[PDB]
Design a protein around this ligand. Sequence first.
Ligand SMILES: NC(=[NH2+])NCCC[C@H](N)C(=O)O
Length: 126
Amino acid sequence: AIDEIKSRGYLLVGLSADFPPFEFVDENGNIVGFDVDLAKEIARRLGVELKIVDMTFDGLIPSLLTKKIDVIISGMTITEERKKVVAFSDPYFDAGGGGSGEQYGIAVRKEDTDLLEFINSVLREL
Ligand SMILES: NC(=[NH2+])NCCC[C@H](N)C(=O)O
């Protein structure tokens, strides 16, 4: 990291802009959606600018591991398989209601505990 992000002055958020209404490319060519608005809010509250890094969906977790992005906010279902490799925020979208079915989370490298705690605070505030 959080201190490193604040020092850099920007948050790099990975997603795959092919999943409306969460992320998509609009009639103007800009990446927009629910997850973009959320990325912006987290950046705003960290005091930093946002850079969205668009990539193919399968590329996200490898990008997060190699530190090309700080977080994934890309309609990503919290799963036990993915918890082997990354940490998730608390869910921010409940596809099925009453916490059933797919719950979307923000993926963070397991080492970045500070950043995950902060993201969880933002989510509760929202
Ligand atoms: N931006 C995207 N293409 N997201 C696809 C998400 C599909 C499903 N929720 C998953 O986590 O695999």
